[PDB]
Design a protein around this ligand. Structure first.
Ligand SMILES: [Cu+2]
Ligand SMILES: [Cu+2]
Ligand SMILES: [Cu+2]
Ligand SMILES: [Cu+2]
Ligand SMILES: [Cu+2]
Ligand SMILES: [Cu+2]
Ligand SMILES: [Cu+2]
Lengths: 461, 4
């Protein structure tokens, strides 16, 4: 028995071109925690932010600095806090040598301009302004680049940032919430270092997914984290181009998932082993109560150590989580509407959706706003296949079934990305609140760039 | 506990 929910035969580690992680010989160092991006101005009703994509240099390994890109920093980005109900104004500035896109993955905003996908280019040296008001539950989202094609290369350079959404309900729960002390991002990525400590996407390119052997956690090699509280909230984001993370602690220390892509979970779910596909988020609580000062607990993926938790002195907490975290209010399907069938096909260069590759001017589907529809999403890859993380812009969906059976224990909240196993049909409940144009695609980023993407137009009827 |  595998400890994870996905189908073992389909794990990334069965690919012929699989790249194992190796522990780097680089020095151990403190986990970089990206600072909170300070607003330009904030009132209760409004918040103003400037977000600048920029090119710089980061000391990742001894010797030469790695050339990297980031938002408001050299690599990755400062964490951006949004609040449900607050009118948000954002100045998007591009100081890169390439055009880019500012994609708010999981933010229910209008498409395709505010959404910041393929049709929202910001050229070098120019600025754009956007505004929106999030009307969605508290969760962890993220920002990343999304020029079509060239998404994979821009993310590789380092254009990803964690986005936190706050709401009244979540503020009232007994959760670690002191950012950088007991509540931290865990942005899981891999890279390959070449001569002079540089990255080289083009040398490492593979149409089925790029992965390197060195794990990078919040832009840090060989990180440790100093624990100064009994409980810690980890916001896991899989920011890798392709790699799956199979997370567990030494000695199978339990942890509890309280959150998924789009919302808190309806109920807490206890885990010893958690698998995350690309773009998935999982918020977990780890209780270090059994441990004493000077102890050490290692977070692993498979047999490879990722992050070392060094236990300092902490005040007792021993709080309980309620049995119910969040009320999931499922919409009613519109019974006039057919079941939508979406089929992901191919591997390597042959990836496609419903028989076609992406065309920027072509609309592939329509759906009325405010009306929930069943989407049946199929991964048609015969064995041996791979888990395809399917993502829909502009919405948070609910998962109803997997091959006619229950979703996984941690998939009863709102989600925007779901891993579809080979041969599997998952049934989703999908509603768009806002009119415009939205993409759906595989979130193995090389698959997206290789054309495994379609666009849907939503309209007011 | 090795993994896989
Ligand atoms: Cu206003
Ligand atoms: Cu404005
Ligand atoms: Cu994304
Ligand atoms: Cu997205
Ligand atoms: Cu184990
Ligand atoms: Cu996308
Ligand atoms: Cu794919």
């Amino acid at each position: 028995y595998t400890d994870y929910f996905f189908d073992e035969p389909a794990f990334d580690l069965h690919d012929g071109g699989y790249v194992p992680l190796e522990v780097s010989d680089a020095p151990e160092k403190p986990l970089n925690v990206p600072p909170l991006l300070k607003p330009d101005k904030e009132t209760a009703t409004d918040v103003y932010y400037t977000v600048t994509a920029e090119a710089g240099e980061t000391q990742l390994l001894p010797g030469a600095k790695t050339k990297t890109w980031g938002y408001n920093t050299s690599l990755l980005g400062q964490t951006i806090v949004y609040r449900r109900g607050q009118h948000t104004h954002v100045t998007l500035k591009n100081t890169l040598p390439e055009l880019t896109t500012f994609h708010w993955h999981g933010a229910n905003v209008s498409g395709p301009y505010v959404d910041g996908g393929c049709h929202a280019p910001v050229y070098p040296g120019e600025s754009k302004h956007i505004d929106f008001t999030l009307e969605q539950p508290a969760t962890t989202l993220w920002l990343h680049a999304h020029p079509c094609p060239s998404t994979a290369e821009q993310v590789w350079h380092g254009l990803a940032a964690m986005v936190i959404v706050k709401d009244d309900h979540e503020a009232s729960l007994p959760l670690p919430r002191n950012y950088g002390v007991d509540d931290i991002p865990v942005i899981l990525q891999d890279r390959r270092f070449h001569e002079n400590n540089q990255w080289d996407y083009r040398a490492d390119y593979d149409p089925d997914g790029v992965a390197g052997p060195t794990a990078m956690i919040n832009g840090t090699i060989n990180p440790y984290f100093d624990v100064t509280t009994q409980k810690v909230r980890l916001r896991f984001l899989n920011g890798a181009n392709r790699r799956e993370w199979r997370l567990h602690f030494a000695d199978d220390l339990p942890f509890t998932q309280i959150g998924g892509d789009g919302s808190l979970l309806p109920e807490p779910v206890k885990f010893t082993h958690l698998m995350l596909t690309c773009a998935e988020r999982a918020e977990v609580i780890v209780d270090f109560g059994q441990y004493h000062e000077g102890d050490e607990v290692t977070l692993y993926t498979d047999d490879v150590p990722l992050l070392k938790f060094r236990i300092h002195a902490f005040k007792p907490d021993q709080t309980t989580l309620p049995d119910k975290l969040f009320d999931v209010k499922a919409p009613v399907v519109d019974p006039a509407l057919p079941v939508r069938h979406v089929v992901m096909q191919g591997m390597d260069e042959g990836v496609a959706i419903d028989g076609k590759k992406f065309a920027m001017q072509r609309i592939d589907a329509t759906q009325p706003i405010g009306k929930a529809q069943y989407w049946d999403v199929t991964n048609s890859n015969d064995a041996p296949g791979m888990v395809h993380p399917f993502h829909v812009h502009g919405t948070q969906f609910l998962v109803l079934s997997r091959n006619g059976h229950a979703p996984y224990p941690n998939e009863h909240g709102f989600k925007d990305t779901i891993g579809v196993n080979p041969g599997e049909t998952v049934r989703l409940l999908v509603r768009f609140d806002l009119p415009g144009v939205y993409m759906y695609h595989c979130h193995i980023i090389e698959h997206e760039d290789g054309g495994a993407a379609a666009q849907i137009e939503t309209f007011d009827p």
